[PDB]
From a paper:
Transcription by RNA polymerase II (Pol II) can be repressed by noncoding RNA, including the human RNA Alu. Here we present cryogenic-electron microscopy structures of Pol II bound to Alu RNA, which reveal that Alu RNA mimics how DNA and RNA bind to Pol II during transcription elongation. Biochemical analysis revealed that Alu RNA binds directly to two molecules Pol II via independent interactions with the two halves of Alu RNA, Alu-left arm (Alu-LA, also known as scAlu) and Alu-right arm (Alu-RA)2.
If Alu RNA resolution was restricted by intrinsic flexibility, we reasoned that a shorter RNA construct could overcome that limitation. To that end, we prepared a minimal version of Alu-RA containing the structured elements previously shown to be sufficient for both Pol II binding and repression. We solved the structure of the Pol II–minimal Alu-RA complex to a nominal resolution of 3.1 Å, and observed that the quality of the RNA density in the initial map was greatly improved. Three-dimensional (3D) classification revealed two minimal Alu-RA conformations. The first RNA conformation could be resolved to an intermediate resolution of approximately 5–8 Å, and corresponded to an Alu-RA–RNA-like conformation. The second conformation could be resolved to a higher resolution of 3–6 Å, in which individual bases could be distinguished. We conclude that loosely base paired regions within Alu RNAs are important not as a mimic of open promoter DNA, but speculate that it allows the RNA the flexibility to adopt a conformation matching that of the EC DNA–RNA hybrid and downstream DNA.
Author numbering:
A (entry chain B): 148 to 196
B (entry chain F): 46 to 127
C (entry chain A): 338 to 865
D (entry chain K): 1 to 115
E (entry chain B): 442 to 456, 462 to 539
F (entry chain A): 11 to 97
G (entry chain A): 1395 to 1482
H (entry chain J): 1 to 67
Write the structure that this text describes.
RNA sequence: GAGGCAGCCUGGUGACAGAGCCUCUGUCUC
């Protein structure tokens, strides 16, 4: 073990990946929330290009 | 300087009018005597303007010249524009 | 470091001595109120309860100040503190015992800001002394500051969410300065240009123009409505301009009661033709386009911005010169309150009807453009044939670009005057362009006829691709379509390329706004 | 925070007079009526009814400001007829019109229900 | 903590270019969708040169012509056209 | 106060004489210790010297009845073991 | 024009092109307190200290910084109680 | 979220017409005929149902705090 | 080109550029190139045939998707400098045989020209009918419109959120608004807008609103404020705890109210909270026997506790969030917008009695001034009110996509005629106060308006001897601190030009940082002064007998001490 | 004690001063404060 | 010098609306009549709510907002209730309020629509209009969600809040062919003719009448349901008469003090 | 990726977030 990489939500390495709309609602996720951001210390963060 | 060879104009400037009224209003609020028969007025800044238009405010204006001399003008000696 | 505490902006001198944060000040959004005098401001009742003025106790007022103390801070009419001769202050917020409600001469009571208190009122950037003027307080419901719309002209204010700062003067000696030096009525005329800084504007100006036509006849019940708003009126109803078959007054005849004293003034309306002063009817003006005020009475002519605007020698300038500030206060206040109440009968609007022209006009516009574009093709044929020869001192390219700019500037103005001639006297764009309240004859041309050439840094749209403007055009295409001539009106809608070129031109205006707003205080600081 | 309570548009506070009568000193036989907690609903009918009286020389109304709920009505009359009488008359004429209009609506109802 | 710190602060280096990693805007859904599609040019905001702020011809179909912020950021902060795709790269082998 | 109120009619700039600093300073032996505190309370000749001002929001200072607000703060000095350039 | 003139007079009254730059101002005869409010606050006061300069307290910024009635407008004159006219 | 009780402009009740409106659309009515059949004559009322978005059908996917 | 279209050896994202005059061929597989899909054109024909649309229609259950369109060689990704080498048709109209031939060798075709716009620019109807600065103002204002921001907003404890009660989808919609999911999560309401000069309260950019619509919930919203709080153990023997404080144990106890707290030291949801109510009781042990760290509800709010949740943080200390809600019924001063850069505050609210009404009894929800239109040339705002009046009557949602040659203001006018309205959308109104017809026929229609994040009760502020800074002893900074307003350099510049010297010394001194120093007469340096002993001294001179009192700003005393720390002697001479 | 509701299995559990927050029967770590019992009055406006 | 003598025709009457025509009255009176229809006819509507549980997806004042808007049958008891300002009791009593109750829990496995049908009242006179025509949806509940609340309805009128406005609309028209020229059409041929128009297809306006004034006012009062549409109109005429006779009394008392 | 001044400075206010033990960043408003 060398460290932790923060994972981009709904990326292929997220736990929300591939879930269907019915599954995300069980997690209290929004099915329309696009992901594509990180959570750090509970704050959603966007890497502007 | 004496009341002779005054070179400043006999008009009271707006700045002198502003400060004379402000000063006299503050005096009237500090229970100075009133030099005019008031007619139901009670605001010291309205009484001040009544004393001004009557020419009754007991103030002398000292106007400094840029050479460092000064002229004294009684408020009654000055013409009021308004 | 110690130097860094002092170095400059936000350092001690500039940051805390040449400017600083102050007690007894308030800020909120501003909103209109046409029911205010130019010398009034509408203050939220919460703000008026939060800010106090220390009033000295005297036998002239102690009976009143005992009540405001006895009401205390939970009421709006009340006081926050009593200051003793010692400077010891009783706080009235938390119920003090009767020993501390005692009042004697020379105490200061921190009474709440009342109706008729005087305040300085300001908007940043404070570009000239007319951006800080004295107002008289009127307390109102709700949380915004209200100012009369004429007073928006000095401040450069508008009600799209602007905020303004109120400063409450705290002593009679500085209360008197603001009254005697800085009140809005004393600020009507500016030493920068001896013009008046305040005019009539927006609805009142478009209504003023419409109200003053010959066509405006008013029945007895309408007149008695308008005359209810004149504060200066003497109570004498004027004999109507028409007595039979039906009593009718005229708009000019009631405006002649708004105009103060015996002012004498002459102006022209914006549409006054060039010939009319030289041919017959030098007087008895056909279109009523020549304004004549005599003895304080509006004898003839349509009033507009040329007459009641902020320019020199306007009817409202001459009012200030002849009558002074105290009366010209009332002149601005009366023009608005009667003529905004008349616009409840006329109304005003703009819609899709006003942005449309006859099928005759649209064919005139299309035939103008179709020739202009074919003329530009002829100039190109000359250049490509090497038949074009340069103007003196100019490059061949500069010659070509000037000739093409010539043809298309002609087309923009030929179609624009065709569109304006096409406008019926009912048209509501015309009703604002002719009053001058808003808009201009180029806006009418762009909405109805042709948006025109789009420029980047004063040139036809650049070849930002290799020898062409966009991937859609072939290379070396100098024609009007290729280089950013928007041959469509806003009603016709832009084509895709025209929409992009119109964004390229609009961006330069957005950049230059940011650059010029990035400088507003710079020169004024160095000068001062 | 600064919202006026909505009942304060029509309920008087303690010691508000509903009406106040002041002689207009500008011109003879003129008078000024201040009506608390009323609006265009009651101003415009009394103006219109006053304008029918041939002994009324001026009638007009305004609300001084829309955010505070009162009307001022100004009435001028010929000599030998007070504006107090003109105002009291105009009210009684409106009460007579409304009760007469009401009775005729009740009849028209029955004629429409039972027919 | 090295990957976490710059994502937490936006400072793109060891404690640098600031203003990467803004907080995701959660005022309205169009805000959120725009924030995830925003682009930034690192040129300093204090200079008065207009040329980098102008809408170049080659933004056609790639970057939104209409959307840019007010103030000193004008024309530098930009947003993608709805069908604009940014390549992710391959090896040329 | 007993003293006459006066306007300031001129400002004279200059440099403090190092003897005037010694004469002016209330830290009669100079600052000697990097520490702020003795037994938690302030160290005389340390960087919170109770003659050099009022320390606490309700305190006093040794040189005048300072009331926190009324005390202007008083100057101290460090005697530099060797002269040094003022930058 | 009376404003355009007053700028052109001030820019030239001292006999040279008085550019309104930092040193263009910091060659004026104005006092050290006014100069420190513009461009180079500390460096101005170092040279005032090293040369023992003085400020006569007769500019506006000067009297502002020390909280006294500016030599301007409503301040530029003085008032005396007419103790004789107080009789009437 | 949920259909307004009143039309904002005029005070006509529309909070009882939403489920009927969807039923009429299930019956392959147009929105025009469905609004007509419901008695929504004024365009100020027709815009209430024609433009409503029943997001409460999305809030009820999430399980409550208490079962 | 062939291999990339077949996707054989070359990934379709590879870009390839012959530069024929340079005799260079360049190939880029580099990351971070920006590119866009274009339809391929061969021999003046699209390669996209009707069969492709049929298969794309079956996408609901058939496997065929966009990948199969790319893999077929029917669309191509092209980058910002391969575009230097293409000829683009704007529509397949450009491929048609024409009497005068512009180009006969197109290589690609634009898919739809409106796809040059972005997210916030695609929620705008008829943007090809607007002055382009106003399309930019909306794209900024769109991001500030309230709506529903995400569906799971009840679990999220976001520090600020605004959710609208009754958002609607627009009656007038750009097709791209589908992909934005603006139907599912809309941010506005269709409102009846009269473009009329009414009583004048909509002058400049102000707006009049129907108060009876506001009573019925028009643009009503709720505001959510979330407070986090965190327990800890500090060192060996200091602890914070959430608990109900008490004045017999906690030093910092206010006279404010702690009885809203439960025994855990937290409120429970459903309790009514106001500014300076304690929402969390927190204490820390003191070496009284605790200091008070309780959090207070941020002042000038009133609300109700919506949720309280309690957890362990990363370190295992008790960690807490409280969410508070308050409803915001729109006031005058609240800011609204039209999707066309027509921002504006509510200037007054008139009840349904007083709003101008049509023969049908329709009052407007909003009245805006006509003077907002001529200089700004937001003609798209007028066409929306027309297309929306047709759409609300037809029972349709109107296609306001830009560059749509199939729609015209003439065609929309014709359709409006058939419903018994004047074809240009004017309507005869009656004055609400007097009932008389208005002489002008007002333009009325349904228009999509927005409520923006900016509200007057966030912004209303006043100062009157509040808190004071430690160093400067001047007023604090900013509304949140009860801060005073900055009377800046340009403000004093005006008060000089006004000659208001006594106001200027009031506002810039006696109403900010008044102070007194004693000064030695013999040298201009501050004297020691024992006001309650009546003794004074100039250490430096041994003067004990001739010392002045001098009023001066505290920030000026501070400057002179900060100058003395640089060895400068700013000697103030009173003589 | 207070009663808090688990965020994962919606069960009540009683919980108390200084007691760590964890949920019996499932081990989940977020709790909600139930809802108040004192009366609040709304205008239907 | 005295009152107008107006006359009425009723041209349509239903449970939903009345059409009627008033002739020979002032436009001022015709307008103040339609103003009273909107805002000074009293009705009963829910004004107080105490929520004892709410587990729905709407917050407590979102539901209480919707309860206020539900139209309650008012016809018979509004005249008998006092205003809550007038009654001498502390808090409420049957003299000035109508008590309502609503308890719902969704125990079934599928969405329970809570509606006006679930509001339950202390008396029969006062039920929701949709029960006195599908019921107004208050909230939708998921399985395990719950809503129980106690409410009171009170007498008031549409000046206080639009929940007390009894009308779903008020048409008002006069001079339907523009004989008075109180509006001026820039192209009169492009205007649809009014319902009450009396013109052929080709003539576009009545020719100008310089002698005329407004004389014939066309109304269409539509009820929301709290009152029958004709008892709205009778309540307005009785109320507006009461407003004027309140003036006349207080005016007479002031004359007996000016004099 | 631009000046200018003798390394620093780039026009007035304003409002919120984030990061750190009051300071810094970003976005936004007129
Ligand atoms: Mg503005
Ligand atoms: Zn001391
Ligand atoms: Zn409706
Ligand atoms: Zn000394
Ligand atoms: Zn659990």
């Amino acid at each position: 073990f060398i460290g932790k990489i923060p994972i981009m939500l709904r990326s292929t390495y997220c736990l929300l990946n591939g879930l269907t709309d019915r599954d995300l609602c069980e997690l209290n996720e929004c099915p329309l929330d696009p992901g594509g951001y990180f959570i750090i210390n509970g704050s959603e963060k966007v890497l502007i290009a | 300087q004496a009341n002779q060879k005054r070179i400043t104009t006999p008009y009271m400037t707006k700045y002198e009018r502003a400060r004379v009224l402000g000063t006299r209003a503050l005096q009237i609020a500090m229970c100075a005597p009133v030099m005019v028969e008031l007619e139901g007025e009670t605001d010291p800044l309205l009484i001040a303007m009544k004393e001004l238009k009557a020419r009754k405010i007991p103030i002398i204006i000292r106007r400094y010249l840029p050479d460092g001399s000064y002229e004294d003008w009684g408020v009654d000696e000055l013409i009021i524009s308004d | 470091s110690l130097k860094q505490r002092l170095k400059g902006k936000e350092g001690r001198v500039r940051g805390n001595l040449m400017g600083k944060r102050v007690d007894f000040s308030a800020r909120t959004v501003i909103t209109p109120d046409p029911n205010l005098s130019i010398d009034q401001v509408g203050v939220p009742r919460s703000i008026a309860a939060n800010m106090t003025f220390a009033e000295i106790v005297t036998p002239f007022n102690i009976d009143r100040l005992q009540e405001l103390v006895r009401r205390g801070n939970s009421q709006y009419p009340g006081a926050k503190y009593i200051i003793r001769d010692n400077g010891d202050r009783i706080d009235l917020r938390f119920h003090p015992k009767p020993s501390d409600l005692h009042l004697q001469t020379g105490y200061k009571v921190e009474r709440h800001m009342c109706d008729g208190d005087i305040v300085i009122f300001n908007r940043q950037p404070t570009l000239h002394k007319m951006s800080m003027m004295g107002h008289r307080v009127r307390i109102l419901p709700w949380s915004t500051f209200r100012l009369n719309l004429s007073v928006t002209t000095p401040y450069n204010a508008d009600f799209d969410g602007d905020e303004m700062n109120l400063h409450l003067p705290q002593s009679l000696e500085t209360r008197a300065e603001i009254q005697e030096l800085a009140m809005v009525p004393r600020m009507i005329v500016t030493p920068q240009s001896n013009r008046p800084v305040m005019g009539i504007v927006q609805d009142t100006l478009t209504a003023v123009r419409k109200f003053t036509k010959r066509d405006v006849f008013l029945e007895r019940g309408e007149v008695m409505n308008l005359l209810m708003f004149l504060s200066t009126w003497d109570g004498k109803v004027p004999q109507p301009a028409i007595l039979k078959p039906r009593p009718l007054w005229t708009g000019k005849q009631i405006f002649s009661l708004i105009i103060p004293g015996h002012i004498n003034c002459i102006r022209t309306h914006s549409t006054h033709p060039d010939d009319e002063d030289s041919g017959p009817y030098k007087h008895i003006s056909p279109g009523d386009t020549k304004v004549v005020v005599e003895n304080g009475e509006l004898i003839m002519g349509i009033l507009c911005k040329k007459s009641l605007g902020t320019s020199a020698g306007s009817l409202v300038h001459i009012s200030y010169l002849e009558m002074g500030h105290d009366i010209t206060r009332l002149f601005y206040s009366n023009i608005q309150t009667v003529i905004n109440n008349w616009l409840l009968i006329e109304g005003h609007t703009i819609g899709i009807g006003d942005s449309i022209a006859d099928s005759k006009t649209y064919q005139d516009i299309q035939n103008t453009i179709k020739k202009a574009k074919q003329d530009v093709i002829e100039v190109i044929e000359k250049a490509h044939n090497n038949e074009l020869e340069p103007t003196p001192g100019n490059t061949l390219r500069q010659t070509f670009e000037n000739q093409v700019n010539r043809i298309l500037n002609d087309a923009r103005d030929k179609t624009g005057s065709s569109a304006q001639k096409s406008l019926s006297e009912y048209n509501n764009f015309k009703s604002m362009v002719v009053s001058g309240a808003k808009g201009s004859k180029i806006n009418i041309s762009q909405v109805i006829a042709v948006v025109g050439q789009q420029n980047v840094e004063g040139k036809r749209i650049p070849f930002g691709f290799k020898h062409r403007t966009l991937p859609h055009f072939i290379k070396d295409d100098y024609g009007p379509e290729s280089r950013g001539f928007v041959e469509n009106s806003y009603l016709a809608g832009l084509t895709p390329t025209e929409f992009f070129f119109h964004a390229m031109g609009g961006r330069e205006g957005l950049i230059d706004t940011a650059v010029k707003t990035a400088e507003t205080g710079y020169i004024q600081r160095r000068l001062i | 925070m600064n919202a006026p309570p909505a009942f304060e548009s029509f309920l008087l506070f303690e010691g508000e007079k509903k009406i106040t009568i002041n002689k207009d000193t500008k011109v003879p036989n003129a008078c000024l009526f201040t009506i608390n907690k009323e609006d265009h609903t009651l101003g415009n009918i009394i103006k219109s009814q006053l304008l029918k009286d041939p002994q009324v020389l001026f009638a007009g109304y305004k609300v001084p400001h829309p955010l505070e709920h009162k009307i001022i009505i100004r009435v001028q009359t010929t000599p030998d007829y007070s504006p107090q009488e003109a105002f009291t008359n105009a009210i009684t004429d409106l009460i007579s019109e409304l009760s007469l209009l009401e009775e005729r609506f009740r009849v028209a109802i029955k004629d429409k229900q039972e027919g | 903590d090295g990957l976490k710190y710059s994502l937490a602060t936006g400072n793109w280096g060891d404690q640098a270019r600031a203003g990467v990693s803004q907080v995701l805007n959660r005022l309205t859904f169009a805000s959120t969708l725009s924030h995830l599609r925003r682009l930034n040019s690192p040129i300093g905001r204090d200079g008065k040169l207009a040329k980098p702020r102008q809408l170049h011809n080659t933004l056609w179909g790639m970057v939104c012509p209409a959307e840019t912020p007010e103030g000193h950021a004008v024309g530098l902060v930009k947003n993608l056209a709805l069908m604009a795709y940014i390549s992710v790269g391959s090896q040329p082998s | 106060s007993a003293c006459p109120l006066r306007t300031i009619k001129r400002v004279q700039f200059g440099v403090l004489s190092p003897d005037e600093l010694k004469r002016m300073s209330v830290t009669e032996g100079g600052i000697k210790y990097p520490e702020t505190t003795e037994g938690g309370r302030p160290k005389l000749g340390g960087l919170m010297d109770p003659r050099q001002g009022v320390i606490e929001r309700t305190g006093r200072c040794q040189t005048c009845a300072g009331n926190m607000t009324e005390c202007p703060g008083h100057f101290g000095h460090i005697e530099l073991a060797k002269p040094v350039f003022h930058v | 024009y009376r404003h355009l003139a007053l700028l052109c007079d001030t820019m030239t009254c001292r006999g040279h092109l008085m550019a309104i730059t930092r040193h263009g101002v910091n060659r004026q005869d104005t006092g050290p307190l006014m100069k420190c409010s513009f461009e180079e606050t500390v460096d101005v006061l170092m040279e005032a200290a090293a040369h023992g300069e003085s400020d006569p307290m007769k500019g506006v910024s000067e009297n502002i910084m020390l909280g006294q009635l500016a030599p301007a407008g409503t301040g530029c004159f003085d008032l005396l109680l007419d103790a004789e006219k107080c009789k009437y | 979220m949920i259909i307004p009780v009143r039309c904002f402009t005029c005070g006509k009740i529309v909070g009882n017409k939403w489920e009927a409106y969807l039923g009429l659309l299930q019956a392959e009515y147009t929105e025009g005929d469905a609004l007509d059949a419901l008695g929504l004559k004024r365009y100020c009322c027709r815009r209430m149902l024609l433009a409503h978005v029943d997001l409460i059908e999305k809030l009820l996917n999430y399980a409550p705090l208490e079962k | 080109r062939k291999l990339r279209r077949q996707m054989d050896i070359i990934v379709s994202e590879v870009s390839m550029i012959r530069d024929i005059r340079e005799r260079e061929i360049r190939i880029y597989t580099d990351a971070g190139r920006i590119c866009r899909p274009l339809l391929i054109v061969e021999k003046q024909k699209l390669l996209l045939k009707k069969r492709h649309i049929d298969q794309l229609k079956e996408r609901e259950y058939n496997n065929y998707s966009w990948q199969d369109l790319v893999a077929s060689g029917v669309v191509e990704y092209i980058d910002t400098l391969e575009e230097e080498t293409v000829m683009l048709a704007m529509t397949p109209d450009d491929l048609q045989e024409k009497e005068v031939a512009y180009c006969s060798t197109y290589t690609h075709c634009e898919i739809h020209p409106s796809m040059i716009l972005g997210v916030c620019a695609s929620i705008i109807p008829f943007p090809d009918h607007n002055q382009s600065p106003r399309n930019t103002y909306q794209s900024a204002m769109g991001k500030q419109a309230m709506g529903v921001y995400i569906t799971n907003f009840h679990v999220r404890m976001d520090t600020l959120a605004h959710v609208l009660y009754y958002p609607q989808k627009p009656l007038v919609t750009t097709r791209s608004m589908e992909y934005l999911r603006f139907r599912e999560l809309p941010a506005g309401i269709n409102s009846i807008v009269a473009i009329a000069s009414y009583t004048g309260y909509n002058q400049e950019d102000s707006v009049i609103m129907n108060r009876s619509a506001v009573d019925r919930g028009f643009f009503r919203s709720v505001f959510y404020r979330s407070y986090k709080e965190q327990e800890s153990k500090k060192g060996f023997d200091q602890e914070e705890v959430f608990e109900k404080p008490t004045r017999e144990t906690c030093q910092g106890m206010r006279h404010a109210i702690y009885d809203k707290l439960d025994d855990d030291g937290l409120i429970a949801p459903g309790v009514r909270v106001s500014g300076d109510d304690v929402i969390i009781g927190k204490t820390v042990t003191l070496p009284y026997t605790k200091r008070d760290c309780s959090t207070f509800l941020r002042t000038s709010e009133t609300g109700i506790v919506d949720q309280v949740m309690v957890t362990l943080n990363q370190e295992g200390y008790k960690f807490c969030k409280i969410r508070v809600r308050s409803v915001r019924i729109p006031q005058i001063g609240d800011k609204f917008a039209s999707r066309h850069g027509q921002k504006g505050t509510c200037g007054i609210q008139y009840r349904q009695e007083d709003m101008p009404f049509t023969c049908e009894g329709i009052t407007p929800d909003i009245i805006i001034n006509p003077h907002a239109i001529p200089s700004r040339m937001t003609i798209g705002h007028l066409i929306e009110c027309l297309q929306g009046k047709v759409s609300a009557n037809k029972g349709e949602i109107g296609d306001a996509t830009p560059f749509n040659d199939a729609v015209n203001v003439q065609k929309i006018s014709n359709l409006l005629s058939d419903y018994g309205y004047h074809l240009r959308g004017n309507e005869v109104l009656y004055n609400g106060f007097t009932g008389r017809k208005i002489t002008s026929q007002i333009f009325i229609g349904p228009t999509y308006y927005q409520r923006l994040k900016h509200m007057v009760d966030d912004k209303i502020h006043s100062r009157a001897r509040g808190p004071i800074q430690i160093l400067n002893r001047q007023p604090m900074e900013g509304r949140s601190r009860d801060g005073g307003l900055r009377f800046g350099e340009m403000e004093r510049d005006c008060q000089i030009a006004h000659g208001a010297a006594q106001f200027l010394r009031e506002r810039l001194f006696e109403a900010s940082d008044p102070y007194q120093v004693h000064v030695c007469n013999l040298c201009g340096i501050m004297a020691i002064a024992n006001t309650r002993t009546h003794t004074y001294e100039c250490r430096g001179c041994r003067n004990k007998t001739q010392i002045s009192l001098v009023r001066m700003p505290y920030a000026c005393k501070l400057l002179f001490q900060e100058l003395m720390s640089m060895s400068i002697a700013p000697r103030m001479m009173s003589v | 004690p207070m009663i808090y509701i688990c965020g994962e299995c919606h069960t009540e559990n009683e919980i108390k001063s200084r007691d760590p927050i964890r949920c019996r029967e499932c081990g989940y770590r977020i709790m909600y404060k139930k809802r108040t019992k004192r009366l609040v009055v709304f205008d239907a406006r | 010098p005295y009152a107008n003598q107006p006359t009425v025709r009723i041209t349509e009457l239903t449970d939903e609306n009345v059409k009627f025509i008033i002739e020979n009255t002032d436009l001022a009176v015709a307008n103040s009549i339609r103003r009273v229809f909107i805002a000074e006819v009293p009705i009963i509507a829910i004004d107080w709510v105490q929520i004892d549980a709410n587990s729905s997806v709407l917050h407590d004042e979102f539901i209480a907002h919707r309860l206020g808007l539900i139209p309650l049958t008012s016809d018979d008891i509004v005249d008998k209730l006092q205003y809550s300002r007038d009654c001498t009791c502390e808090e409420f009593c049957p003299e000035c309020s109508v008590e309502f109750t609503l308890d719902v829990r969704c125990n079934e496995d599928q969405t329970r629509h809570v509606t006006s049908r679930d509001l339950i009242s202390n008396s029969p006179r006062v039920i929701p209009v949709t029960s006195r025509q599908d019921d107004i949806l208050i909230v939708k509940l998921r399985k395990g969600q719950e809503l129980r609340l106690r409410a009171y309805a009170k007498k008031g009128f549409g000046k206080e809040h639009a929940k007390w406005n009894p009308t779903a609309g008020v048409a008002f028209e006069y001079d339907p062919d523009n004989a008075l020229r109180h509006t001026v059409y820039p192209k009169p041929e492009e205007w649809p003719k009014s319902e009450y128009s009396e013109l052929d297809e080709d003539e576009s306006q009545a020719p100008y009448d310089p002698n005329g004034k407004p004389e014939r006012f066309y109304y269409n009062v539509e009820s929301c349901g709290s009152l029958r549409p004709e008892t709205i109109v009778l309540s307005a005429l009785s109320g507006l008469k009461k407003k004027l006779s309140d003036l006349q009394t207080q005016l007479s008392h002031e004359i007996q003090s000016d004099v």
